[PDB]
């Protein structure tokens, strides 16, 4: 019936798009960003969603929730949830077989199902769409990884219900990005979707035959992405600060919070320019942090992790029994595909083959979902 919006509900960032006047508009949040962190905090009884929540992550690790997409539709006993709980800094309890996030609210223990946190992120995406369109939004197209089972797909629809959204269709993330580049109805082609995000890495082979995408092969690394590239820069500067001033910055959380924020900005900056400056006045009492980070240094610290992304690319091609030449189209997805070195490594692997270009790679999935939303509307 009414407006239908497309939403990219990602592990680390979220993005919303609308299809109006025969084109897609990727919407800005309160801070003027087309992307919103999938973080929720409950510090001093104040619920915050997005970048305001992401900032509390270091100072308040028990009150800040994120990476809830790794728990959604799963049992506490799942092999992947056991590996994740050991990595997540906030408390995850076993609520009679189902994982629950335990936080303190008004001095009381409060438990949330993973779909309750995801719904708070969807509530923010829905509100951005409502004030932009000037109309009530109920229907939405939401994306999910191609590997997501029936439980994970339904748990996402349930997060939508809590948020007041009727998720009319759940589509695959690599199918959404290929749709964004108008690759549907290309008749007899093979598409390789290289998706490197904040926390996960996914490679998918898509085949299009009469406007219908078939997910031919998938591979990846659930613990490889952007936040890893940060940690490597983080490690380097902590080591450097220890050898210069004899102070371990890891003991001071206010110091780690300032450095973490500056490292994320510095990394982004290196995607457009070749050098950047990290300046933090009084990182600790009586010490000013001032260091240069070159694009070259950023690449040297992450080279192994960058090339590691080619291992699942080799696997999809091997599983599909494909030569490199069989790939007709390359689609880059994820905030980390903005890294000039990552683009160069994929191009070099595909012997000079240029990928598709025209959409910000962190917005391509939400762009695809809004195209799908417009098809459903008619
Ligand atoms: N300009 C950029 N250059 C490099 N990395 C970027 C840039 N923009 C975003 N990123 C990184 O992209 C990652 C998030 O990826 P994204 O695809 O948006 O989310 P998700 O993984 O949740 O699907 C973060 O690690 C972020 O720092
Ligand atoms: Mg994504």
Residue numbers in the entry: 27 to 404
The article reads:
GRP78 is a molecular chaperone that resides in the lumen of the endoplasmic reticulum (ER). The GRP78 chaperone belongs to the Hsp70 family and it is composed of two domains, a nucleotide-binding domain (NBD) joined by a flexible linker to a substrate-binding domain (SBD). The chaperone function requires ATP hydrolysis, and substrate binding accelerates its ATPase activity. The malaria parasite possesses a functional GRP7815, which has been shown to regulate eIF2-α–mediated arrest of protein translation, an essential function during the schizont and gametocyte stages.
The crystal structure of PfGRP78-NBD in complex with ADP was determined at 2.3 Å resolution, and the final model included four chaperone-nucleotide complexes in the asymmetric unit related by non-crystallographic symmetry (NCS). As expected, all of the molecules showed unambiguous electron density for ADP and a Mg2+ atom in the active site, since these compounds were added prior to the crystallization process. The PfGRP78-NBD showed a classical HSP70 NBD structure composed by four subdomains (IA, IB, IIA, and IIB) arranged in two lobes, with the ATP binding site located at the bottom of the crevice between lobes I and II. In PfGRP78, the ATP binding site was sandwiched between the IA-IIA and IB-IIB subdomain interfaces. The bulk of the interactions with the base and sugar portions were associated with the IIA and IIB subdomains, including all the residues involved in H-bond contacts. While the phosphate moiety and the PO4 made extensive contacts, including 7 H-bonds, with residues from the IA and IIA subdomains; residues from the IB subdomain provided additional phosphate contacts; this subdomain also created a lid that trapped the ATP hydrolysis products. The presence of ADP and PO4 in the active site is consistent with a post-hydrolysis state, and it has been previously shown that product release is the rate-limiting step in GRP78 and other HSP70 ATPases19. All four molecules of PfGRP78-NBD in the asymmetric unit showed large inter-lobe interacting surfaces involving 117 residues and an average buried surface area of 2230Å2 (range from 2168 to 2313Å2). The first was between residues Y39 and K80 (K81 in human), and the second included residues K80 and E290 (E293 in human). These interactions were present in all four molecules of the asymmetric unit in the PfGRP78-NBD crystal structure, but were absent or not always present in the human protein. We propose that the lower substrate, product and inhibitor binding affinities observed for PfGRP78-NBD compared to the human chaperone are a consequence of a more rigid lobe I-II interface in the malaria protein.
